mmCIF file of C-alpha atoms and ligand atoms in Angstrom:
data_model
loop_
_atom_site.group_PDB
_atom_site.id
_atom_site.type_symbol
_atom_site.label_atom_id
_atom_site.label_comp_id
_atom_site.label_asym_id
_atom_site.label_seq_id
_atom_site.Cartn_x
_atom_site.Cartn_y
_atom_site.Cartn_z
ATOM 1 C CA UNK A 14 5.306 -51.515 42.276
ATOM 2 C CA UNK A 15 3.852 -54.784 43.319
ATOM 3 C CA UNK A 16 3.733 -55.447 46.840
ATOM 4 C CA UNK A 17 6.715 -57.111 48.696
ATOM 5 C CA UNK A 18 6.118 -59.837 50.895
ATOM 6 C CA UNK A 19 5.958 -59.469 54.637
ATOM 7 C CA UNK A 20 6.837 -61.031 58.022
ATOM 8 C CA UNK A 21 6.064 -60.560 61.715
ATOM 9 C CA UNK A 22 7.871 -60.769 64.756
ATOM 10 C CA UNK A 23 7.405 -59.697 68.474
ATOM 11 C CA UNK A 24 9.849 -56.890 69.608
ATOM 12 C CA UNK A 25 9.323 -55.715 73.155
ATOM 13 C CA UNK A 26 5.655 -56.852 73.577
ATOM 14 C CA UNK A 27 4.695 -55.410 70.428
ATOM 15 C CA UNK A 28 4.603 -56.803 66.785
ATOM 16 C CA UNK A 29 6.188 -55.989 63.884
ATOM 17 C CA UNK A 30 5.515 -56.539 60.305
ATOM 18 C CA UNK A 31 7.830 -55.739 57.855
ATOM 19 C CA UNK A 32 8.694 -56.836 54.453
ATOM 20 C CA UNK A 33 11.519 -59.104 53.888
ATOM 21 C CA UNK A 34 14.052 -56.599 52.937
ATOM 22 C CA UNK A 35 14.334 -55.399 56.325
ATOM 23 C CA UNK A 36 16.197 -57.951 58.146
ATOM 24 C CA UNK A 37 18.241 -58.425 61.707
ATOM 25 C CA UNK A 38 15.641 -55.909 63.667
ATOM 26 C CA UNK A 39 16.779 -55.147 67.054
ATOM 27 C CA UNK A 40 15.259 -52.151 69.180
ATOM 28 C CA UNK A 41 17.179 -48.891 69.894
ATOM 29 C CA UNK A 42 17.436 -45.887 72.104
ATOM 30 C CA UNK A 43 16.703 -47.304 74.929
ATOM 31 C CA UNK A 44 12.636 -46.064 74.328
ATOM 32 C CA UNK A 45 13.913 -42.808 74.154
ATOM 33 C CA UNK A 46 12.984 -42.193 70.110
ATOM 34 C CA UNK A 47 9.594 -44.053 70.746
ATOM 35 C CA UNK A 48 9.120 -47.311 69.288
ATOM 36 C CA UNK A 49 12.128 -47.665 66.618
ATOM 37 C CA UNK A 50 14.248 -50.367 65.572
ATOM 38 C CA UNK A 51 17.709 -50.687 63.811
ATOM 39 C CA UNK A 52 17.551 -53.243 60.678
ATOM 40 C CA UNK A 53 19.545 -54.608 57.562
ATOM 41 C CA UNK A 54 17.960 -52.777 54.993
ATOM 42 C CA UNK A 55 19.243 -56.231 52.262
ATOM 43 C CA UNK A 56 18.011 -54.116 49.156
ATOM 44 C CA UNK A 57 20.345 -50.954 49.828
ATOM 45 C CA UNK A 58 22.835 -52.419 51.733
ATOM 46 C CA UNK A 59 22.204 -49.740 54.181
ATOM 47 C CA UNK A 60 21.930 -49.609 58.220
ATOM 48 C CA UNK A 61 18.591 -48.283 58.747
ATOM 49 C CA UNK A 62 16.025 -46.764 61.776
ATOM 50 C CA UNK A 63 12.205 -48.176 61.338
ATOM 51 C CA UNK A 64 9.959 -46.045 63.671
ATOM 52 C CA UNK A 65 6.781 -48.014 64.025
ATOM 53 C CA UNK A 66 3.762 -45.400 64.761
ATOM 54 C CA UNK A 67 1.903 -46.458 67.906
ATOM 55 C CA UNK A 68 -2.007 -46.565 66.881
ATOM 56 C CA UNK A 69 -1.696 -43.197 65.072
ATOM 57 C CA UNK A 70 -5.476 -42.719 64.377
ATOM 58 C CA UNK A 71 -6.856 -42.968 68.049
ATOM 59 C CA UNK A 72 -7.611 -39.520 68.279
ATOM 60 C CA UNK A 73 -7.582 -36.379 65.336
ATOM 61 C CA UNK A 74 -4.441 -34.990 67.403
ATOM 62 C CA UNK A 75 -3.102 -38.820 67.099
ATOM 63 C CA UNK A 76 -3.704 -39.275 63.223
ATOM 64 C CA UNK A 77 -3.059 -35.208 62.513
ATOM 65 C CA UNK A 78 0.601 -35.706 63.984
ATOM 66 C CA UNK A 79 0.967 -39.072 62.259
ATOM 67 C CA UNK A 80 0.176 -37.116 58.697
ATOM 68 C CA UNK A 81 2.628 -34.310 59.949
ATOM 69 C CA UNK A 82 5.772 -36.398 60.810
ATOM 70 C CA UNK A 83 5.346 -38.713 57.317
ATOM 71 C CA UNK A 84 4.510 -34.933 55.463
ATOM 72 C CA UNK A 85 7.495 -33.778 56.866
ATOM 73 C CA UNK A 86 9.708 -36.601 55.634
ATOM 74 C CA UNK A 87 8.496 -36.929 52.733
ATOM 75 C CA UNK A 88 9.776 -33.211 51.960
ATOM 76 C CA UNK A 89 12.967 -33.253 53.289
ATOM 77 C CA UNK A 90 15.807 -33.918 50.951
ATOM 78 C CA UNK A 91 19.515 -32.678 52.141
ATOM 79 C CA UNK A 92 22.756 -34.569 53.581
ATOM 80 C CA UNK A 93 22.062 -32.907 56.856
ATOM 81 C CA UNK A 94 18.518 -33.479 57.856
ATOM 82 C CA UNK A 95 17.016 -36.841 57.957
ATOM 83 C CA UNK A 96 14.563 -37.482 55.131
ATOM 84 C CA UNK A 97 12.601 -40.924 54.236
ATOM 85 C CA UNK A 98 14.058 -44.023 52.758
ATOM 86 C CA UNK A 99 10.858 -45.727 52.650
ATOM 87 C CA UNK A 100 6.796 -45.819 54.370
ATOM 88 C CA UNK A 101 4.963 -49.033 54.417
ATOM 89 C CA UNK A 102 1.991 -50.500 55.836
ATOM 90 C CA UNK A 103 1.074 -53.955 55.655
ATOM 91 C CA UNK A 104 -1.865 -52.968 55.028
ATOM 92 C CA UNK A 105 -3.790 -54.184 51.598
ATOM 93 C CA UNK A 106 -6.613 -50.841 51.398
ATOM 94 C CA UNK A 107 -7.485 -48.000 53.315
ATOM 95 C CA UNK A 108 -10.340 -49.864 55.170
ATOM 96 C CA UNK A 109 -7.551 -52.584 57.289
ATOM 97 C CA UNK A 110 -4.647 -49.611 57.176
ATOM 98 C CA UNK A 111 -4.036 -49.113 61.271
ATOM 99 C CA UNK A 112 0.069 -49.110 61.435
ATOM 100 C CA UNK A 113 2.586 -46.851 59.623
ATOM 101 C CA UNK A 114 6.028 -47.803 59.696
ATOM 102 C CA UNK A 115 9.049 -45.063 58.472
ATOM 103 C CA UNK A 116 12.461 -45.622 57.563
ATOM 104 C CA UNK A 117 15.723 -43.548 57.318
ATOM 105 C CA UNK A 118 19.136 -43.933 57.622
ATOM 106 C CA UNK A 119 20.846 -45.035 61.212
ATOM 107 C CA UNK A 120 23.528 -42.148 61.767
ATOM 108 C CA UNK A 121 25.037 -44.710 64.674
ATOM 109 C CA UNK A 122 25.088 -42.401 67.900
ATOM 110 C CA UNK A 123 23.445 -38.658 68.371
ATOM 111 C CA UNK A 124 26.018 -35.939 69.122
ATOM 112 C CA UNK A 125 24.947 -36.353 73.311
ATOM 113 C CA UNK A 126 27.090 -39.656 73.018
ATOM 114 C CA UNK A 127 29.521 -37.939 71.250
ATOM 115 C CA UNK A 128 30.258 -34.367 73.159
ATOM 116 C CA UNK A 129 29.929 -36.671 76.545
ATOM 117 C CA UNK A 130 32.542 -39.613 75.322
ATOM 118 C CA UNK A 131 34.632 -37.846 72.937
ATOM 119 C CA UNK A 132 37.439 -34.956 72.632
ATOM 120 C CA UNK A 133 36.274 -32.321 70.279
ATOM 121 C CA UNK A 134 39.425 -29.867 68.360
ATOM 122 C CA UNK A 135 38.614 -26.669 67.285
ATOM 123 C CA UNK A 136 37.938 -28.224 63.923
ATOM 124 C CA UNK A 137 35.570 -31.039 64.973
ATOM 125 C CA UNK A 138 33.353 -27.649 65.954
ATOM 126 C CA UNK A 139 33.568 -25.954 63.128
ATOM 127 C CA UNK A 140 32.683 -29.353 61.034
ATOM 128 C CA UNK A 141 29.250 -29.789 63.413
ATOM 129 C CA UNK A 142 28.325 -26.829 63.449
ATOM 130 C CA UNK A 143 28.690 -25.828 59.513
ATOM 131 C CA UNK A 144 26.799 -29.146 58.831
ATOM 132 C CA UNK A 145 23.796 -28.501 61.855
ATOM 133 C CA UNK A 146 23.934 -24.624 59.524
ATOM 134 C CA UNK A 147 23.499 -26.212 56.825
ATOM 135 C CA UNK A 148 20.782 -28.379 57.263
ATOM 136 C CA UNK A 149 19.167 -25.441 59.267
ATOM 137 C CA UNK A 150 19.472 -23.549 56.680
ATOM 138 C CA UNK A 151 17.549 -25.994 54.350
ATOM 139 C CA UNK A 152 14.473 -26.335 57.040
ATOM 140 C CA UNK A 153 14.004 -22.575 57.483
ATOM 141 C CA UNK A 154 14.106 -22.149 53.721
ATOM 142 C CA UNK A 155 10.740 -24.186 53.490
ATOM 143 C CA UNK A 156 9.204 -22.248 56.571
ATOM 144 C CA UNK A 157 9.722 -25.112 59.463
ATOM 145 C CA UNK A 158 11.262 -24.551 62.535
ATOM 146 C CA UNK A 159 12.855 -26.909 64.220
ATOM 147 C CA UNK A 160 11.959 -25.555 67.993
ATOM 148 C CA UNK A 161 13.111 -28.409 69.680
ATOM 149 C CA UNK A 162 16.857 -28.512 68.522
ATOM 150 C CA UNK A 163 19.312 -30.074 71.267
ATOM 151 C CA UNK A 164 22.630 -32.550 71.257
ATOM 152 C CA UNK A 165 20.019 -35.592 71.431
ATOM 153 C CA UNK A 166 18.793 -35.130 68.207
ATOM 154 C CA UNK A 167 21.399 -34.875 66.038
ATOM 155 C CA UNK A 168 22.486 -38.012 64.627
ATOM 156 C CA UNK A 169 25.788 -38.818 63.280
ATOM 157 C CA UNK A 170 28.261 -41.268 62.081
ATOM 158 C CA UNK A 171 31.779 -42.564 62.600
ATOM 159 C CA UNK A 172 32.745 -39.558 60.108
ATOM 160 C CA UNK A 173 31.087 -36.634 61.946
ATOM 161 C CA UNK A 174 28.833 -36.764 59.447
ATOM 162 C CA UNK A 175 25.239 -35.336 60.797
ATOM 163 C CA UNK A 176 21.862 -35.552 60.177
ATOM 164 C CA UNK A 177 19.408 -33.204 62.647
ATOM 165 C CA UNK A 178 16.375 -35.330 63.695
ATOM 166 C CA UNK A 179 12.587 -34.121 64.769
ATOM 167 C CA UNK A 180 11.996 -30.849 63.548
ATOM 168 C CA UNK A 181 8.807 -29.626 63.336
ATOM 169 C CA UNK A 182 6.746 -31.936 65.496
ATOM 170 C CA UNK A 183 6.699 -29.462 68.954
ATOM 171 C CA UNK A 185 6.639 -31.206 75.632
ATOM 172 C CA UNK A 186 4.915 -31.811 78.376
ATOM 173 C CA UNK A 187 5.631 -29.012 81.009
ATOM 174 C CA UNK A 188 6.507 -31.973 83.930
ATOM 175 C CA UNK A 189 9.370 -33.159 80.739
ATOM 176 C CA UNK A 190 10.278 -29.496 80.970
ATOM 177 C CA UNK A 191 9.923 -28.800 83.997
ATOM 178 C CA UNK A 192 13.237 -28.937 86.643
ATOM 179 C CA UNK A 193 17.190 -29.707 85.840
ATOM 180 C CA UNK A 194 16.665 -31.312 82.370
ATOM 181 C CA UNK A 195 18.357 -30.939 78.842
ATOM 182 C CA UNK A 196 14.755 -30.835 77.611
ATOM 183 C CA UNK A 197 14.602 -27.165 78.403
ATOM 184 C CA UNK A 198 18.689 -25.729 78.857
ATOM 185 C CA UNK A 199 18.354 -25.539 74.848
ATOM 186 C CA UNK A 200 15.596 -23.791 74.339
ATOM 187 C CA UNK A 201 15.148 -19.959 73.114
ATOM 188 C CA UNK A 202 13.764 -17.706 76.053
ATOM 189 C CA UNK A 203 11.171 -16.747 74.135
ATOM 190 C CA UNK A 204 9.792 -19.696 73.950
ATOM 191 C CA UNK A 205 10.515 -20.878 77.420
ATOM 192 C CA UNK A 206 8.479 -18.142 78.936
ATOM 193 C CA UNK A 207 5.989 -17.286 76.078
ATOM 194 C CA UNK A 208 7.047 -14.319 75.490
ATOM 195 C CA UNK A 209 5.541 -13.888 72.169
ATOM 196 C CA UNK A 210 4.771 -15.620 68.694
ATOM 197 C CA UNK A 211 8.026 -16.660 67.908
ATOM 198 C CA UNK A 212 10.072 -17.776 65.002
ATOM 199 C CA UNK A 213 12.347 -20.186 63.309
ATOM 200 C CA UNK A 214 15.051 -17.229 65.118
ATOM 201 C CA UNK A 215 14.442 -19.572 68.595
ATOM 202 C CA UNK A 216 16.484 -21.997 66.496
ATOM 203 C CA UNK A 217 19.508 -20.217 66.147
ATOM 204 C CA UNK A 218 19.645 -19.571 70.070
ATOM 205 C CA UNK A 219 19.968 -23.372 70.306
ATOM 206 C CA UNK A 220 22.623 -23.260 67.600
ATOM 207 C CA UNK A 221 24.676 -21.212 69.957
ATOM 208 C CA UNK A 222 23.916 -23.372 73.172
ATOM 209 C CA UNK A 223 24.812 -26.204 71.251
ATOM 210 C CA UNK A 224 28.290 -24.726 69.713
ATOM 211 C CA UNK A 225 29.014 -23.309 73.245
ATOM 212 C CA UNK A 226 29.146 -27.050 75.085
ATOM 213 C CA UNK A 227 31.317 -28.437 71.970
ATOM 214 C CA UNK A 228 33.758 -25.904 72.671
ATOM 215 C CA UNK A 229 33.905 -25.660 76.701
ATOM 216 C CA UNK A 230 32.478 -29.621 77.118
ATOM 217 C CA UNK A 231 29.814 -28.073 79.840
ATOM 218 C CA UNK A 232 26.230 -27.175 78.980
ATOM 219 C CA UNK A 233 25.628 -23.426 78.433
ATOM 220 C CA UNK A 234 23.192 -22.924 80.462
ATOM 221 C CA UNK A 235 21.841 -25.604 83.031
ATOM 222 C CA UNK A 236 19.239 -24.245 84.821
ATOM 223 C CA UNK A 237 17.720 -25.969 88.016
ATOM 224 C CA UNK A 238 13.682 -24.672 86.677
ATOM 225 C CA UNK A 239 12.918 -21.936 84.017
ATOM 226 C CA UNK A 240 13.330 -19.052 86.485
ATOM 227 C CA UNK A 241 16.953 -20.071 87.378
ATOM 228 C CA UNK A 242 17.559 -20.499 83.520
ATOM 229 C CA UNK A 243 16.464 -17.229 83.016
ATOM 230 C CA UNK A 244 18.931 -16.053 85.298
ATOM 231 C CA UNK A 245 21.486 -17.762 84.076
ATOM 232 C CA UNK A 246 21.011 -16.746 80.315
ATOM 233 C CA UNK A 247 20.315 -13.067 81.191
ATOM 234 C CA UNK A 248 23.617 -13.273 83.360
ATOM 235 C CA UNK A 249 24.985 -13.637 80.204
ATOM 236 C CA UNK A 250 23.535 -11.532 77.677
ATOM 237 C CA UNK A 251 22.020 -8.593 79.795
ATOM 238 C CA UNK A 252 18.902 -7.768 80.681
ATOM 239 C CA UNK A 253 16.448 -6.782 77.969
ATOM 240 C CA UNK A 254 16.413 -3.126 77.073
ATOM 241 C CA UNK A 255 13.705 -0.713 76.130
ATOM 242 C CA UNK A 256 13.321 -2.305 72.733
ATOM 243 C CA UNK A 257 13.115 -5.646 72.775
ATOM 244 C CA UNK A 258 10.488 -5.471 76.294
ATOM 245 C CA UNK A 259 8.198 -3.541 73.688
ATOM 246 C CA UNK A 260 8.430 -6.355 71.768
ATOM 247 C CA UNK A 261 7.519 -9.136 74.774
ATOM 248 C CA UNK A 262 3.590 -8.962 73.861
ATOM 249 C CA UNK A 263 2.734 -11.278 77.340
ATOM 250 C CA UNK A 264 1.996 -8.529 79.702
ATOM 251 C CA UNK A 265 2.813 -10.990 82.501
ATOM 252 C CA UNK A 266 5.994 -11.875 81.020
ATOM 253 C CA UNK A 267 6.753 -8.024 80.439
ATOM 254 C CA UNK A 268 5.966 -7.387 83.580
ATOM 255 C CA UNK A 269 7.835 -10.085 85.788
ATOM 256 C CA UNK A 270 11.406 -9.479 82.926
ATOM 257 C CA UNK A 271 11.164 -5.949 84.244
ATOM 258 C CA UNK A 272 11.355 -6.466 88.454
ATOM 259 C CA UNK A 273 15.068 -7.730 87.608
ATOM 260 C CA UNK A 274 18.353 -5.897 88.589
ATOM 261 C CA UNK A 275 19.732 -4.836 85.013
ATOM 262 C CA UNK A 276 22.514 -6.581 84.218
ATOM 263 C CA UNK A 277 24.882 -6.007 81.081
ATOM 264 C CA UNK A 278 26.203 -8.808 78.776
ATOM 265 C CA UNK A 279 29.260 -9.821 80.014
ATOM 266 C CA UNK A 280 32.478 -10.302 77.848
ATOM 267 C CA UNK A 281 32.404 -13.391 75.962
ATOM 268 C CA UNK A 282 36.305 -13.840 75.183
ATOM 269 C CA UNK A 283 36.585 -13.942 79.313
ATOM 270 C CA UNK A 284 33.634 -16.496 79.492
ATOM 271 C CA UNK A 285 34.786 -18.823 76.590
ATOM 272 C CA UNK A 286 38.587 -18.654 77.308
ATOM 273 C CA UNK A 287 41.011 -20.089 74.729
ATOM 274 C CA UNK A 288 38.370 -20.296 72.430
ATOM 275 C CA UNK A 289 39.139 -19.012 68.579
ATOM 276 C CA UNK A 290 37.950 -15.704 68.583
ATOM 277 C CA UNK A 291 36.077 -16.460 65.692
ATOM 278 C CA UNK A 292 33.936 -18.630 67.335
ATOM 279 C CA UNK A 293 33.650 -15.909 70.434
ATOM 280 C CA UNK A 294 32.213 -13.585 67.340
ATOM 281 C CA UNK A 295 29.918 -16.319 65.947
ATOM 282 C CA UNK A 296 28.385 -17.126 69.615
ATOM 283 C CA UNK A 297 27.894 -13.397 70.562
ATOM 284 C CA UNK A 298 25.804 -13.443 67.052
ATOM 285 C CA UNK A 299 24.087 -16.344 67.534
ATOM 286 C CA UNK A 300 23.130 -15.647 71.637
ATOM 287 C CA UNK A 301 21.056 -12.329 71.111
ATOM 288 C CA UNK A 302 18.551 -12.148 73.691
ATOM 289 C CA UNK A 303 16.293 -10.219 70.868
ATOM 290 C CA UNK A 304 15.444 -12.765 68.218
ATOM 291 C CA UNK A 305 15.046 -9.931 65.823
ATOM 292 C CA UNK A 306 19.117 -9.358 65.511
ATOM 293 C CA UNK A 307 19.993 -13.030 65.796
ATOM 294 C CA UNK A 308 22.532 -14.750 62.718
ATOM 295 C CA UNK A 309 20.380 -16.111 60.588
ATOM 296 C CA UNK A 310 21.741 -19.785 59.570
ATOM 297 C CA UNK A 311 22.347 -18.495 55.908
ATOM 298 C CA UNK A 312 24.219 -15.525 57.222
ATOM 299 C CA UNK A 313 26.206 -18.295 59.526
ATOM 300 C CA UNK A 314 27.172 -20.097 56.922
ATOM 301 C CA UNK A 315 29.218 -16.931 55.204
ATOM 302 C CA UNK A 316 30.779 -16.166 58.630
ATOM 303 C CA UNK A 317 34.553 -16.848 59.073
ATOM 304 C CA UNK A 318 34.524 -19.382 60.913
ATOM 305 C CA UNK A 319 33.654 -21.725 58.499
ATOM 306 C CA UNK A 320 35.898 -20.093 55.903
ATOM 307 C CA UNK A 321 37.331 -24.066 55.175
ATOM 308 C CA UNK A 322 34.308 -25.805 55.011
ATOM 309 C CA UNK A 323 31.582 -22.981 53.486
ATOM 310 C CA UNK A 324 30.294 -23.729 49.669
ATOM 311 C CA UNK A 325 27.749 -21.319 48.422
ATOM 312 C CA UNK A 326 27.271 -23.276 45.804
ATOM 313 C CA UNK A 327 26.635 -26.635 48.458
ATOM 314 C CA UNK A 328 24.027 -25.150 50.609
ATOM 315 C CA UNK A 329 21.294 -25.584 48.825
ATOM 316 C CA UNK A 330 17.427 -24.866 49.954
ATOM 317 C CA UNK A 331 14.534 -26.609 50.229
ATOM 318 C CA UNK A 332 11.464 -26.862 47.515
ATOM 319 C CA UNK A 333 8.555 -25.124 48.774
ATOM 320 C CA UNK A 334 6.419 -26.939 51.470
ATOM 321 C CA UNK A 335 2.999 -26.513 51.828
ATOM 322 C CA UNK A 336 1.776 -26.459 55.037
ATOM 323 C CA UNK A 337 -2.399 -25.206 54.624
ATOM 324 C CA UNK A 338 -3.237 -28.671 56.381
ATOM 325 C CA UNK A 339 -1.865 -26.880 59.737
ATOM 326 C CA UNK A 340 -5.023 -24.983 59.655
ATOM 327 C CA UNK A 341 -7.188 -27.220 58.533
ATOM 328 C CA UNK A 342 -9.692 -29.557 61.098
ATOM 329 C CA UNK A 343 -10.200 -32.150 59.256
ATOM 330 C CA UNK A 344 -11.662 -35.531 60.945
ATOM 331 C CA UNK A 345 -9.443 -39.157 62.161
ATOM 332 C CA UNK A 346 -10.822 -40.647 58.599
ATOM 333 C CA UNK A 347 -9.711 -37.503 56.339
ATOM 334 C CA UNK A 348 -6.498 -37.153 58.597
ATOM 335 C CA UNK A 349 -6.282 -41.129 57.894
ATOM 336 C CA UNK A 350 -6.764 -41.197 54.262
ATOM 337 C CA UNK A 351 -4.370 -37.815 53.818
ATOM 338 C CA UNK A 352 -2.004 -39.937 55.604
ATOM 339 C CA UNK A 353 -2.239 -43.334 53.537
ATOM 340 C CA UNK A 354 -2.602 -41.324 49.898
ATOM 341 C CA UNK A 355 0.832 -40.076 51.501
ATOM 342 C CA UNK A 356 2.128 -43.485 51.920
ATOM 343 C CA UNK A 357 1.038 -45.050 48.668
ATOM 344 C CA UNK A 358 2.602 -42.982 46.549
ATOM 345 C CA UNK A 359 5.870 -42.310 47.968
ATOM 346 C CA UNK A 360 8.819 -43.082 45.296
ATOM 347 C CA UNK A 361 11.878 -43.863 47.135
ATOM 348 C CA UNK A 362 15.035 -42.056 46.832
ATOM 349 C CA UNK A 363 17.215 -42.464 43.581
HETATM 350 C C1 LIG B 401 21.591 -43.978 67.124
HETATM 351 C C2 LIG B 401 20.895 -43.440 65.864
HETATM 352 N N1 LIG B 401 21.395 -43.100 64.651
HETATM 353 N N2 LIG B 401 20.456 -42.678 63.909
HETATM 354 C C3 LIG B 401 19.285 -42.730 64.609
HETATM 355 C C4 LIG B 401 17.951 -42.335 64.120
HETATM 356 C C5 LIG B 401 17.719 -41.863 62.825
HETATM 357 C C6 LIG B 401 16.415 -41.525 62.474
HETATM 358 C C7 LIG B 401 15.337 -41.605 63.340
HETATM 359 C C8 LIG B 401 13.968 -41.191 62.889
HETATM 360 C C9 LIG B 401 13.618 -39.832 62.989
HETATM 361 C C10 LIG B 401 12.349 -39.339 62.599
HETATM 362 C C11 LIG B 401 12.118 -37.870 62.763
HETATM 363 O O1 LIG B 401 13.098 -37.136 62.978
HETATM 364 N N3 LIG B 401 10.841 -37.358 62.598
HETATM 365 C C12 LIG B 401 10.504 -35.955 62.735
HETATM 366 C C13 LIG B 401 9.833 -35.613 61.446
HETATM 367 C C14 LIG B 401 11.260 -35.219 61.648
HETATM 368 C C15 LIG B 401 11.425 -40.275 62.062
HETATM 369 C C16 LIG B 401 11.764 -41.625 61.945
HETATM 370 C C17 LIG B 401 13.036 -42.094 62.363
HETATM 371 C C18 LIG B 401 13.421 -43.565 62.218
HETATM 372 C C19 LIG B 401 15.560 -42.049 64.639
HETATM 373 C C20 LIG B 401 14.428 -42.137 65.634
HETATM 374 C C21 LIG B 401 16.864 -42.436 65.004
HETATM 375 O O2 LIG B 401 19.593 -43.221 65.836
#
């Protein structure tokens, strides 16, 4: 409708102007989710996040990300996945319109500050997992992938409630490179290029995930990507005739193949005391060929969430076009995609 009023203030050597609504801003993550801020959002009532873009239309990578991240919330709409409360600029027309500001909900922690300071029962698992399922499930239905899916970005609230944060936006290889949760999540396919992969890689995480809730210890820490590999393949086995047909990087192929074969061990011995349903789930979720991974909707019928699974509750996403992925397209066309975006988003009922 008409437009609200606004007002500035200086938050870690940067300003921000917001309108009035939006009150008690104080930063958060410790610059770990970029520029964000908690606020009072008066109007709702609600705790919010406000990400801030930094100068998102310095370079066509710059303003073609900026249109992906406020494209992608804009679409999503389920309990479990973050979605968009609200985009403003304070910007009067497309000529002064340099700053995009987003805002969602503010889960309260991410399920790292949980997993680390917390005891997790059996059914604390099963809850986190159905829900991360769930919201998977709605992501892959409109033809995202996640790809970067680890404890950090997974918020949630005082009820285990959780939202899954940053899908679709795909490192440096320094932030990947050594002993770092950046990379002990990620599929192997995708670590080592193995081939064009797909929204399978993030059902590998799933299981990496769901493993460390259950034992409190990360899967599999890895000191670099080659002593990752080592440790995952200790696991699950070596690759077998199939899926090495399947690893399209020669190189890859090639280097897989100069290891000592190694079976998959025996799950119920590596996850002792664990409920053997969740044994079963994990040996379907960590399948070194992405091929013959659990899907989520598959994981959402499995018995182990007999208590919390709805069929008629997991519902999937409307379809998303994505053509603009394809498209090059100049800063000033990415720019005015990005503020036709803006101006007519309708906020949630
Ligand atoms: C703590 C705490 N509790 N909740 C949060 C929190 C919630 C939402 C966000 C958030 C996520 C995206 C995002 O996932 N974009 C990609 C397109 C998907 C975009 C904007 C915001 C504010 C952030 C940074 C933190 O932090």
């Amino acid at each position: 409708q008409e437009r609200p009023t606004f007002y500035r203030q200086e938050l870690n050597k940067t300003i921000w102007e917001v309108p009035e609504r939006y009150q008690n801003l104080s930063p958060v993550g410790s610059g770990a989710y970029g520029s964000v801020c908690a606020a009072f959002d008066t109007k709702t009532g609600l705790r919010v996040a406000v990400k801030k873009l930094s100068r998102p239309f310095q370079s066509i990578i710059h303003a073609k990300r900026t249109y992906r991240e406020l494209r992608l919330l804009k679409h999503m709409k389920h309990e479990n996945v973050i979605g968009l409360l609200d985009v403003f600029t304070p910007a009067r027309s497309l000529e002064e319109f340099n700053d995009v500001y987003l805002v969602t909900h503010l889960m309260g922690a991410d399920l790292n500050n949980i997993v680390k300071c917390q005891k997790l029962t059996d059914d604390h698992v099963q809850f986190l997992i159905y829900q991360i399922l769930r919201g998977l499930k709605y992501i892959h239905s409109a033809d995202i992938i996640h790809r970067d899916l680890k404890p950090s970005n997974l918020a949630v609230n005082e009820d285990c409630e959780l939202k899954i944060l940053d899908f679709g936006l795909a490192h440096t290889d320094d932030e990947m490179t050594g002993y770092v949760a950046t990379r002990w999540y990620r599929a192997p396919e995708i670590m080592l290029n193995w081939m064009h992969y797909n929204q399978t890689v993030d059902i590998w995480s799933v299981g990496c995930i769901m493993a460390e809730l259950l034992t409190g210890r990360t899967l599999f820490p890895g000191t670099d990507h080659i002593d990752q590999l080592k440790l995952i393949l200790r696991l699950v086995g070596t690759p077998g005739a199939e899926l090495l047909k399947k690893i399209s990087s020669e190189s890859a192929r090639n280097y897989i193949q100069s290891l000592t074969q190694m079976p998959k061990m025996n799950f119920a011995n590596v996850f002792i005391g664990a409920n053997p349903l969740a044994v079963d789930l994990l040996e379907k979720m960590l399948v070194l060929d992405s091929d013959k991974r659990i899907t989520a909707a598959q994981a959402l019928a499995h018995a182990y969430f007999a208590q919390y699974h709805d069929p008629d509750d997991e519902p999937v996403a409307d379809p998303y076009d994505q053509s603009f992925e394809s498209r090059d397209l100049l800063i000033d066309e990415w720019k005015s995609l990005t503020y036709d975006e803006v101006i007519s988003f309708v906020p949630p009922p």
